[PDB]
Amino acid sequence: ESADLRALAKHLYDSYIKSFPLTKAKARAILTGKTSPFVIYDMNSLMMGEDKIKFKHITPLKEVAIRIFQGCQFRSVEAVQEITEYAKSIPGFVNLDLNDQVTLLKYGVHEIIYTMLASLMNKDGVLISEGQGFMTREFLKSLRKPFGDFMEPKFEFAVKFNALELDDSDLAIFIAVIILSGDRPGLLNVKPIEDIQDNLLQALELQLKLNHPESSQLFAKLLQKMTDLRQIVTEHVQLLQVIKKTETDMSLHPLLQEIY
Amino acid sequence: NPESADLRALAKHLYDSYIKSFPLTKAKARAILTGKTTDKSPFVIYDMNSLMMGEDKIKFSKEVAIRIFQGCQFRSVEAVQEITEYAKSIPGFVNLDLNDQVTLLKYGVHEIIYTMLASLMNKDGVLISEGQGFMTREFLKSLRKPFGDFMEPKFEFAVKFNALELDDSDLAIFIAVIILSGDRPGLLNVKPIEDIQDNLLQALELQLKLNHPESSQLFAKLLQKMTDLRQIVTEHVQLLQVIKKTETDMSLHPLLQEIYKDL
Numbered sequence: 001e002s003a004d005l006r007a008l009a010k011h012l013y014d015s016y017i018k019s020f021p022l023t024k025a026k027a028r029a030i031l032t033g034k035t036s037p038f039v040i041y042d043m044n045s046l047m048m049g050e051d052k053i054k055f056k057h058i059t060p061l062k063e064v065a066i067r068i069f070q071g072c073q074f075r076s077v078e079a080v081q082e083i084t085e086y087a088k089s090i091p092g093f094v095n096l097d098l099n100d101q102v103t104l105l106k107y108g109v110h111e112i113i114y115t116m117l118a119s120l121m122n123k124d125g126v127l128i129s130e131g132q133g134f135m136t137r138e139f140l141k142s143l144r145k146p147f148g149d150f151m152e153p154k155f156e157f158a159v160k161f162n163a164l165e166l167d168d169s170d171l172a173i174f175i176a177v178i179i180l181s182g183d184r185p186g187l188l189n190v191k192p193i194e195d196i197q198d199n200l201l202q203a204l205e206l207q208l209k210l211n212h213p214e215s216s217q218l219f220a221k222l223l224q225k226m227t228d229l230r231q232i233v234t235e236h237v238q239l240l241q242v243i244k245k246t247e248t249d250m251s252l253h254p255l256l257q258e259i260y
Numbered sequence: 261n262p263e264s265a266d267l268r269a270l271a272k273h274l275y276d277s278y279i280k281s282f283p284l285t286k287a288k289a290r291a292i293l294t295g296k297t298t299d300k301s302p303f304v305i306y307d308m309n310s311l312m313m314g315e316d317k318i319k320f321s322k323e324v325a326i327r328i329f330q331g332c333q334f335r336s337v338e339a340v341q342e343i344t345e346y347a348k349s350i351p352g353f354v355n356l357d358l359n360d361q362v363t364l365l366k367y368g369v370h371e372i373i374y375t376m377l378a379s380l381m382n383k384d385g386v387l388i389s390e391g392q393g394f395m396t397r398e399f400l401k402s403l404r405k406p407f408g409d410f411m412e413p414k415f416e417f418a419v420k421f422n423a424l425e426l427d428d429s430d431l432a433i434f435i436a437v438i439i440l441s442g443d444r445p446g447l448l449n450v451k452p453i454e455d456i457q458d459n460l461l462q463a464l465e466l467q468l469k470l471n472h473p474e475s476s477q478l479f480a481k482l483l484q485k486m487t488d489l490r491q492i493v494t495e496h497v498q499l500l501q502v503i504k505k506t507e508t509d510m511s512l513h514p515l516l517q518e519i520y521k522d523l
């Protein structure tokens with residue numbers, strides 16, 4: 001039966017490659033050197049960044065910290081569509097109750113967003129605009145409160161997550177496992193969701209044993225990261241609320257706010 | 261093989277220690293709850309008068325809801341002591357840096373407390389006073405705010421956790437796994453903790469495979485429960501903060517205070 005789990009693993013990797021333009025392998029090459037990205041490490045470099053390279057998530061449409069924070073939201077929305085497309089390639093997903101598909105994505109995309117963002121981070125900063133740029137951790141941390149601490153929690157997670165040394169083929173299955181979570185609020189038919197996830201989990205276990213035979217209990221260690229992920233998401237929602245209640249300079253064009 | 265042999269010996273050691281440390285097992289709780297016998301019937305507390313007769317029938321201020329809350333504190337402290345005793349039996353634990361031993365218990369005890377409290381619960385209520393009593397979930401909800409909803413999320417977790425149908429032999433290893441968590445804040449020496457947990461995880465994996473061979477991915481499902489646990493603790497802390505502000509006349513136990521401090 002093992003043949004089916006390997007076919008699924010390959011299937012998911014291929015789809016993952018199709019859906020996500022910037023892979024972990026590509027991002028690592030850039031991050032470590034082997035090539036080159038424009039570095040944003042302060043206000044002047046940010047501005048040159050905008051001018052020479054035109055980071056579309058920083059395009060016109062104000063205060064720097066606010067525009068950066070909004071740029072994050074813009075890219076996040078963009079990423080949701082890549083994930084949605086990936087989801088439809090997971091065997092069984094499209095066959096689920098349509099409301100459940102919506103629910104699974106609604107609750108799953110944030111977890112997936114921060115998982116994949118780790119692929120774009122090291123302890124020193126993060127790749128932006130399709131790897132064209134690299135924004136430093138310290139520059140982000142330097143932003144005025146409450147924006148100074150907005151990315152930092154993701155960096156902390158990424159550093160820990162990245163120590164697992166997962167590759168794209170590992171991540172493709174993990175992301176699938178995240179989407180097929182049977183505990184999302186408001187699901188109408190949990191059974192086929194858990195059944196698909198049980199299959200993904202089997203596929204994930206084998207992939208990790210085959211791909212990382214030396215890494216004892218990697219499967220267990222990866223599953224444990226779900227705690228870290230959800231905590232990051234919860235924490236992000238909490239900040240969004242704060243800045244929405246306080247902060248008076250956040251508004252965009254009403255259609256832009258609707259979109260994002 | 262020799263490797264599996266060592267993991268089985270580990271599982272046996274932990275189960276043995278668990279039975280030695282925890283006076284009310286899940287096996288006994290279930291026997292009491294399934295109410296199949298004549299010697300183990302609990303007195304059921306479901307309102308005020310039946311409460312008032314409890315204090316007479318069962319052997320354990322002049323207020324009401326504080327009494328239940330403080331009875332619950334006392335039990336929690338007792339549970340910490342049982343769990344601390346169990347921890348010492350986990351191979352390698354007492355050999356760790358002393359500061360890390362404290363840290364591991366500080367963050368681990370409540371996750372374990374709610375994990376094990378599930379054993380004493382069904383959708384209708386919870387065993388109390390070493391199984392001699394049973395307090396209904398509805399009664400607990402009938403309590404004045406903020407007390408009125410301290411337990412509900414525990415009940416919610418329990419019903420879904422209990423669907424895994426774990427037994428004590430499984431639980432002994434799982435709680436060991438929880439304690440030996442290398443990602444507790446402020447740990448000095450993460451590696452030796454992680455090394456211990458890895459072997460515990462191996463033992464847990466094998467245990468579930470042998471004990472529930474028909475239960476697909478039970479190992480993974482169990483591990484995902486650890487985020488449910490973290491979240492219950494999170495809620496409980498905030499609920500406590502609210503209490504400390506509305507109920508200035510209510511004492512909290514010093515041990516519990518220290519555990520929650522800067523958590």
Ligand SMILES: CCCOc1ccc(C[C@@H](Cc2ccccc2)C(=O)O)cc1CNC(=O)c1ccc(-c2ncccn2)cc1
Nearest residue numbers: 327328329331332333335336370373386388389411496516
């Ligand atoms: C009683 C309902 C649920 O039980 C909980 C619930 C939670 C915990 C752990 C929790 C306790 C706590 C309370 C307040 C502040 C801080 C902690 C925790 O430590 O987080 C234990 C327990 C265990 N409690 C008991 O066995 C128990 C013992 C005695 C009584 C009781 N005694 C007299 C009159 C009525 N009831 C009730 C309950």
